[PDB]
């Protein structure tokens, strides 16, 4: 007999104590080594419910990643409209590492192993687990990078589908590699390469998975104009902040060719951690490169009294908690009394 619970969880990672990289430095003074033998108990004849959208584990990771960037990627100037804090700006070795989340004494984690678990609802396959899988705190918009993959079909995640402005998390079952690079002109000029045939295939597969829910024609369109972090593919690569134009990825005219998305490394950004803006030093020297798995897509549907046949979807993230949701969705905490 056990019901729900909410507790201050602890973290675990294979973080090296000698590494200069800040994800290791943070997990060295905040986490412990991973558990060698992860005992998992496939408790069958069990049926309990989960909710990724009301999961406090997502709130805890949001804190830990914010505090990580706070002591690591220290912005030179920070704005909240009022507070104008001005700090030193040294460069940093940056590369996310897996982060396991586990429970204290008395509490424990339940994992829903139904391979089509859509985020909310009951599961039969539920096992008694001890820690979560190694999640890399990759912060990004539009495209989920370097995460886990849906084992069977594409999982369309949301809180209320048939309600309009609620962010969608498309969980792909096959990765599509994206290869972003700043060469060695302009130091801020950069670009990502991505195979068009494979991106067309998966976006076609996502369009079919969207037709199973809504009996209409699915169309992709670039966002009409929010902030730059929402309209473009915004991600952090080795400290430097990339803004990559994805018009060529979400215009329904994705072609055969290897697509080169124009990118830029901007110094003044809007902060994902909270309200306000930050400023960082100009980018480092040499060649800056990040090769990433695209494991998920963040979408927002075009609403309105859609007696129209076409249903338009546009890329947009914004809420970084949803990034930790697409990895922590299969984890609910309980308490044995």
């Amino acid at each position: 007999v056990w019901r729900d619970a909410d507790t201050t969880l602890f973290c675990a990672s294979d973080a090296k104590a000698h590494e200069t990289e800040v994800h290791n430095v943070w997990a060295t003074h905040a986490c412990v080594p991973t558990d060698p033998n992860p005992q998992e108990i496939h408790l069958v004849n069990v049926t309990e419910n989960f909710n990724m959208w009301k999961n406090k584990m997502v709130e805890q990771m949001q804190e830990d990643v914010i505090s990580l960037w706070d002591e690591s990627l220290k912005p030179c100037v920070k704005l909240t409209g009022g507070s104008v804090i001005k700090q030193a700006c040294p460069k940093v070795s940056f590369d996310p590492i897996p982060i396991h989340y586990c429970t204290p004494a008395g509490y424990v984690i339940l994992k829903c192993n139904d391979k089509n678990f859509n985020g909310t609802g009951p599961c039969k396959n539920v096992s008694s687990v001890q820690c979560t899988h190694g999640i890399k705190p990759v912060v990004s918009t539009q495209l989920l990078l370097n995460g886990s993959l849906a084992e069977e079909e594409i999982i369309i995640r949301s809180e209320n589908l048939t309600d309009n402005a609620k962010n969608i998390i498309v969980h792909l079952n096959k990765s599509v590699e994206i290869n972003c690079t700043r060469p060695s002109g302009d130091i801020r000029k950069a670009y990502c390469e991505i195979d068009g045939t494979e991106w067309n295939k998966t976006l076609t597969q996502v369009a079919e998975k969207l037709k199973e829910h809504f009996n209409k024609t699915i169309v992709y369109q670039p966002p009409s104009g929010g902030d730059l972090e929402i309209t473009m593919h915004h991600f952090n690569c080795r400290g430097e902040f990339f803004y990559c134009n994805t018009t060529q990825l979400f215009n329904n005219s994705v072609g055969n060719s290897t697509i080169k998305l124009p990118c830029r490394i901007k110094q003044i950004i809007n902060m994902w951690q909270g309200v306000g803006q930050a400023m960082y030093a100009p980018p480092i020297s040499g060649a800056i490169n990040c090769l990433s798995n695209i494991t998920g897509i963040l979408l927002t549907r075009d609403g309105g009294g859609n007696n129209r046949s076409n249903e338009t979807f546009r890329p947009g993230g914004g809420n970084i908690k949803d990034n930790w949701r697409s990895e922590l969705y299969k984890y609910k905490v309980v308490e044995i009394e």
Partner: antibody
Amino acid sequence: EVQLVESGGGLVQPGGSLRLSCAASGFPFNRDWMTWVRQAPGKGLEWVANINMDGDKKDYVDSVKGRFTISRDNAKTSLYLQMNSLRAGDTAVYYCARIRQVSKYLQWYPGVFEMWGQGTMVTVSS
Amino acid sequence: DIVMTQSPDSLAVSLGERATIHCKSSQSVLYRPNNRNYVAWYQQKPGQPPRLLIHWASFRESGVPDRFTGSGSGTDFTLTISSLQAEDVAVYYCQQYFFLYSFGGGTKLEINR
């Protein structure tokens, strides 16, 4: 320049044992995968074994598991292949080759054989 | 294990003419997330160790002339020599490195003069 020099090799009785060595120079040997590949006289190339920078990752061709051992000495920049229970099918020219890493499954895997030694002849006969 | 089968087993091409060598993999060596084919071509001149010509099916190593061109995808690969030269007489091997390693049987390229 890059230089891989195989050593050992010669006549071995059937069922005997032999150890080959590869003296490498001219490249960060302690950071590269290395491999052994053989060619029986008149026949084609057959990959034998390979090993990573730190010696913890080794792989072998099936007809060789159990009686060959690939190893390395990064302090000596040398690759080794201990052969036991040799038979006529092992008579070949054994090549030492440098492996170039390649992206596969978003990780670093051993790839093409970018540089080759001249080879040493191993003869298994009565 | 992946098996590579080359064709033809041998051929004789006049100087300045086209030489075509095919390679077939038992299963697909095409990794779709990056659209890359894990196939290489090697050249073995008489009395010399093999020499890497082309990696990733279609990418030439530095120094290798333009007349060598690799192509194909999935399980069907081809090495083409556009205008054959005397120095091209050798045995050509294809190799897959998708799962471990394995070589093709080899293709002996004779020159007709």
